[PDB]
Amino acid sequence: MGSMAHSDGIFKKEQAMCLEKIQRANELMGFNDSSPGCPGMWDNITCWKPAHVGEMVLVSCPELFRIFNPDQDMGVVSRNCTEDGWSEPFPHYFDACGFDEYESET
């Protein structure tokens, strides 16, 4: 009752699988002192690669008409990345793309 497993927000293995490669890109990076930014991040529906300063990444789900098998990168959410870090979701989240849904069509 207090703690839920959240079967809806499980995003398959993509949660631990993507966050694992982002952790490697975190300490290894590739920006240095020229074009800084974020070291990577993982949200509630899509994977985010290390972005630069003032970058708005819009990542949509493969085939917006035939959303069946979810590989990676879903729900087009544009999150900016300034020098302070990551900004707020816009479009907002609240379950962006339907991948764990039943009959998503109609």
Binding site: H6, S7, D8, G9, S35, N44, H52, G54, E55, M56, V57, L58, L64, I67, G75, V76, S78, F90, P91, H92, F94, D95, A96, C97, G98, E101, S104, E105, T106
Partner: protein, 33 residues
């Protein structure tokens, strides 16, 4: 630094897609929250 491509994308993202995809598929879900 893709602000040149995301410039016009802010027209069909938070404006259109917001209610389009987050309303067509979902109907009795939103159990994650």
């Amino acid at each position: 630094f893709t602000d040149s491509y995301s410039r016009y994308r802010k027209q069909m993202a938070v404006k259109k897609y917001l209610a389009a995809v987050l309303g067509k598929r979902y109907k009795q879900r939103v159990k994650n929250k």
